């Protein structure tokens, strides 16, 4: 009826991965003619 270091590292890794993936996706979305 009734029934910190690792968490910080996981949060930092997840945030970094999300930021990198978002930046990569945004860069890819840029027009090809505008990436020469």
């Amino acid at each position: 009826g009734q029934l910190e270091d690792m968490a910080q590292r996981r949060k930092e890794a997840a945030d970094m991965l999300k930021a990198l993936q978002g930046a990569s996706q945004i860069i890819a979305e840029i027009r090809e003619t505008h990436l020469w």
């Binding site: 930021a19 945004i26 840029i30």
Partner: protein, 241 residues
């Protein structure tokens, strides 16, 4: 041309919102010798005088110049994150409450006041880079970062660790492999040596970014050889001169 600047703006906004500054988004870092024309180059790119020069440098915080071209098709993108503005030229700061400033002198005064308030008595650095956005039709889409040089002149006294703080800030800004280091130097210092070249050689054994910009090429004297100035056969750079 109209896409990279909005991308950088969105990335900077996301970084500010999340409060994380471990890495910096791709951009161009402007570094060089003291009084080497960096402020003059920035003013010329903007088209008007809005930064200190000579023995009057007071804004030691990192200023990010994000020039945005103004066009009919670009109105929606520029006003997507803000409200409709009919002014041809206007400026704003991300850290501010979406305030709009037009006069260049007023913008300079506000930036100096904010820098003095944040830095307080000490003239060190803070983890809150100044963000500047310019929407003018005479400026093409481009992003630049301005940092203080070797301002050893007694313009009000500086902390002993001012040089260390400046070096740390420059190193952090260039830590991003996607960020280009702009070596702004006068005619005399074409490509032989510079702080930008030294930091590029320190960060990486060679460094895949080397651009040299020469300023003050109008008051020269006739009859002086300048083959190395243009051709640069001594230390040619990857990105040209």
């Amino acid at each position: 041309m109209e896409a990279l600047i909005p991308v950088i703006n969105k990335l900077q906004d996301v970084f500010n919102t999340v409060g994380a500054d471990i890495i910096q988004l791709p951009q161009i870092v402007v570094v060089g010798t003291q009084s080497s024309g960096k402020s003059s180059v920035l003013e010329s790119l903007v088209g008007r005088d809005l930064l200190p020069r000579g023995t009057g440098i007071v804004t030691r915080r990192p200023l990010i110049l994000q020039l945005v071209h103004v066009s009919q098709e670009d109105k929606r993108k520029t006003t997507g994150e803000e409200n409709g503005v009919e002014a041809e030229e206007w400026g704003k700061f991300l850290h501010t409450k979406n305030k709009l400033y037009t006069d260049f002198d007023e913008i300079r005064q506000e930036i100096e006041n904010e820098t003095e308030r944040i830095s307080g008595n000490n003239k060190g650095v803070s983890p809150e880079p100044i963000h500047l956005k310019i929407f003018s039709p005479n400026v093409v889409n481009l992003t630049l970062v301005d940092l203080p040089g070797m301002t050893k002149v007694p313009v009000g006294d500086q902390p002993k660790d001012i040089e260390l703080q400046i070096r740390e800030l420059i190193l952090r800004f260039i830590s991003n492999p996607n960020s280009i280091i702009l070596a702004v130097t006068a005619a005399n210092t074409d490509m032989a040596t510079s702080e930008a070249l030294k930091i590029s050689r320190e960060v990486d054994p060679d460094g895949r970014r080397t651009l040299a910009v020469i300023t003050k090429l109008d008051l020269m004297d006739a009859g002086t050889d300048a083959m190395d100035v243009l051709m640069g056969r001594v230390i040619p750079v990857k990105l040209g001169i």
